[PDB]
Ligand binder design. Structure first.
Ligand SMILES: CNC(=O)[C@@H]1CCCN1C(=O)c1ccc(Cl)c(COc2cccc3c(C(F)(F)F)cc(C)nc23)c1Cl
Length: 218
């Protein structure tokens, strides 16, 4: 039953999102002072990367837990479970941060409060931080429901075209099932128009430039 899988994806998503959606929205009034922004900008590139690296690592463990709890995934061979997570975990982290993004004031939720891209200046990757805000702004524009983002992030993960898959049929099958679920659920709710406004490799290319940098922080 497609309906079991849908309820499973939504359950796991509800249980594995690091921050509650009510808490992010209640916190949108809480914005970093220019003093606080100065404090972050003053930090060494080493310090800012270590502290962001730490946050990213923690987030990936929530995507790992999201994958493990969503049944059909645990039935794939361990090799394929590893290939899909390493290929998609960060892309899933990126999609998720659009919930912690306020398009009203181009702010993202970060270590307790909200701030703009100028907070991350010490990373010395303004291009990349701009890519991340732009992508979050585009995604916020869809006004996803929790169910829509749960099902979308499941398809970000269950992708039969990832290189290095052993049982490429068993992944196609799960992906095809998630597609039927997602397409049916959008069509039944007249939400099918958002499929045009979804990014293409654009999740892949976004982080390519800077990602293997994280290995020397851990
Ligand atoms: C408690 N946890 C949190 O609040 C969450 C976890 C995910 C977002 N987050 C942050 O604290 C956080 C919030 C906003 C931003 Cl802009 C950032 C910094 O983001 C990144 C900086 C460097 C590299 C990043 C890269 C790449 F791929 F480049 F590593 C990729 C992604 C997607 N984000 C990068 C971070 Cl680390």
């Amino acid at each position: 039953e497609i309906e079991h899988l849908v309820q499973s994806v939504c359950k796991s998503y509800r249980e594995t999102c690091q921050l509650r959606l009510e808490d992010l929205l209640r916190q949108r009034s809480n914005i970093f002072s220019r003093e606080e922004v100065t404090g972050y900008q003053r930090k060494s590139m080493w310090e800012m990367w270590e502290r962001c690296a730490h946050h990213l690592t923690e987030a990936i463990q929530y995507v790992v837990e999201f994958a493990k709890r969503l049944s059909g995934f645990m039935e794939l061979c361990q090799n394929d479970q590893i290939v899909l997570l390493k290929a998609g975990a960060m892309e899933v982290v990126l999609v998720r941060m659009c919930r912690a993004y306020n398009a009203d004031n181009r702010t993202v939720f970060f270590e307790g409060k909200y701030g703009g891209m100028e907070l991350f200046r010490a990373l010395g990757c303004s291009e990349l931080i701009s890519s991340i805000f732009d992508f979050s702004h585009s995604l916020s524009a869809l006004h996803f429901s929790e169910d829509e983002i749960a099902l979308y992030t499941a398809l970000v993960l269950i992708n039969a075209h990832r290189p290095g898959l052993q049982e490429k049929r068993k992944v196609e099958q799960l992906q095809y099932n998630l597609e039927l679920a997602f397409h049916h659920h959008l069509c039944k709710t007249h939400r099918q128009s958002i499929l045009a406004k979804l990014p293409p490799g654009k999740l892949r290319s976004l982080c390519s430039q800077h990602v293997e940098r994280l290995q020397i922080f851990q």
